[PDB]
Amino acid sequence: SITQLFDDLCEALLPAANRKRAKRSLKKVAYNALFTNLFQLPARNKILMLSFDLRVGGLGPKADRLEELVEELEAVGSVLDLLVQLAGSGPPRDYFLNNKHVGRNVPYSGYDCDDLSVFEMDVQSLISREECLCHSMIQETLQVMEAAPGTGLPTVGL
Amino acid sequence: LVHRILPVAASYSAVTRFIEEKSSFEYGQVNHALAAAMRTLVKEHLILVSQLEQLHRQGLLSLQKLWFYIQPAMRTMDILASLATSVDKGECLGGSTLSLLHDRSFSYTGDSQAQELCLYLTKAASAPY
Amino acid sequence: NLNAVRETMDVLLEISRILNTGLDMETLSICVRLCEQGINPEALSSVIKELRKATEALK
Amino acid sequence: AAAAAANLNAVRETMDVLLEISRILNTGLDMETLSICVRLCEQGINPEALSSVIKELRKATEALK
Amino acid sequence: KSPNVLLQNLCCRILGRSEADVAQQFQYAVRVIGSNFAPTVERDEFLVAEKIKKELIRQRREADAALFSELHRKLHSQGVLKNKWSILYLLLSLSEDPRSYATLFAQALPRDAHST
Amino acid sequence: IRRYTDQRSLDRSFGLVGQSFCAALHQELREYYRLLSVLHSQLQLT
């Protein structure tokens, strides 16, 4: 069962990309940390409570996608309650936004200043990254190549 | 631009002058009710300009925004001023200015923004008859 | 049953990718079997965050 | 404190004014619902958005009756 | 605290059902309240004052409409409310008469003639 | 589009199916000015 699958988990967190006695030490720290918390519909609602915070924080189609998937997840129950409590632990375009050139019936309306004003900003975050990239690759190498004499790689420490 | 905005003021002076003149007993109970239902929309113009006053006090009102704001209320005012000119022009009182209201009520059907306005004044003015 | 659990393992990847977990497929497979045991998932989300901290303390 | 109980008096004053306005209009809300609606309206919310909900939840308790 | 569970507190008060007993309604609540949170129309407490007066005329009352102005005075004298426009617009929208066309009657502006 | 409406709205002896097109052509100028109002707010421009 699960405590044998836990051994495969202890092999994953150890670098595979030796490795037999470091596993016995990592297994000790794994078991020593595991039992501290364990010693001491209202379920889809927890996903809805974060979809609200999605909709307030911009990004409309992501929350509209999330509420489209929580209907099919109800058409194993302890797994999504783990996912909702691991939702912010994750790793840190589109041609259309304002084209009425397609369709057969589109409603007549004016400007709003929250659609096309924030469609040049969707690209402005891209152009303001692709130059901040240029400052995060020439700095990270000039920090290696110039500090002071006697600084470099630890092969001189051999 | 100021001159482009001004016809709704020329079409408010005439409206209030009609409401003062034709609420008297020389024009009968139908004209009393007619100006008394025209008065309700005059109150609404007074409401609108105070909301725009709150906008100007917060430094959030300009000439361009005002010109767009007054355009939906200009059509209603235009209906009232044309109606007042027509009843003054033919000296119509009693049931002739219920016949005129019957003609004007069928006249406006284009957007149905003016149709409801004239229909309310006919509903109010046909009560004494 | 063995045909069912492969399809369930494929669909349970999707709902954990949209919610932006830190879980990869292997640790997803271990944690999907562990949550199905009955041990409260509200505590399992915390023991994983402590395990991944104590392994980084050694590195 | 003492000045912290005067502010707890000045909120009951407001809540009584709002409780008066709620009854002279003969609304559907009771005093307990109203205490959630004051918290919502303090944050800054469209009152056009909440009223449509309240119009559906009161017909969703005719889907309970 | 967060606004979303506060919506479920409202859901416990109006329904006989608890918040844990229903999730189809809370789905719709998350649909409506999100992306229409934080005012997007022009505020005016004055129009709300004159429309609560306009409603008390519809109940054939003139005494209670000038007592409402004193409650409107007291509302400002305490001054602990953030949007005095919003809660009174909200109570006015949920008003029920004890016992046509009104879109051509004065309303708040959409702020689509203005940058937001 | 404004020049055509400039004579049609002062002609009251005309088709009432043409004074419905012309009243679906007041909305189409009001919306132009709406567009301009939003642009005027953003002025405080290249």
What would your notes on this structure say?
The structure is cut from a larger assembly and holds 1 copy of chain A (158 residues), 1 copy of chain B (129 residues), 2 copies of chain C and 2 copies of chain E. Chain A has 158 residues and is an all-alpha fold. In chain A, 53% of the residues lie in helices and 0% in strands. Chain A contains 8 helices and no strands. In chain B, helix 2 runs parallel beside helix 4 and helix 5 packs antiparallel against helix 6. With 59 residues, chain C is mainly α. Chain C is 78% helix and 0% strand. Chain C has 3 helices and no strands. With 116 residues, chain E is mainly α. Chain E contains 5 helices and no strands. At the D-E interface, helix 1, helix 2 and helix 3 of D face helix 1, helix 2, helix 3, helix 4 and helix 5 of E. The PDB classes it as cytosolic protein. Keywords: Assembly, Intermediate, Complex. Structure of recombinant human gamma-Tubulin Ring Complex 12-spoked assembly intermediate (spokes 3-14, substoichiometric spokes 1-2). Chain A is Gamma-tubulin complex component 6. The organism of A is Homo sapiens.
Helical percent range of chain C? over 70%
Distance between the termini of chain A: 46 Å
Q: Fraction of residues of chain A in helices?
A: 40-55%
Biggest sheet features of chain C: none
The structural class of chain C is mainly alpha
Radius of gyration of chain C: 13 Å
Strand content of chain C: under 5%
The total strand number of chain C stands at 0
Which overall shape of chain A is indicated by the principal axes computed on the Cα atoms? flat
Task: Give the assembly state of these chains.
Answer: part of a larger assembly
The overall strand count of chain A is 0
Can you summarize the main beta sheet of chain A?
none
Question: What sort of overall outline of chain C do the alpha carbons produce when their principal axes are compared?
Answer: globular
Number of helices, counting only DSSP H or I runs of 4 residues or more of chain A: 8
Rg of chain A (C-alpha, Å):
26 Å
- Tally of contiguous helical segments of chain C: 3
Order of helices and strands of chain A: HHHHHHHH
Largest interface: D-E, 44 and 48 residues
Protein name (chain F): Gamma-tubulin complex component 3
Family (chain F): Belongs to the TUBGCP family.
Organism (chain F): Homo sapiens (Human)
Subcellular location (chain F): Cytoplasm, Cytoskeleton, Microtubule organizing center, Centrosome
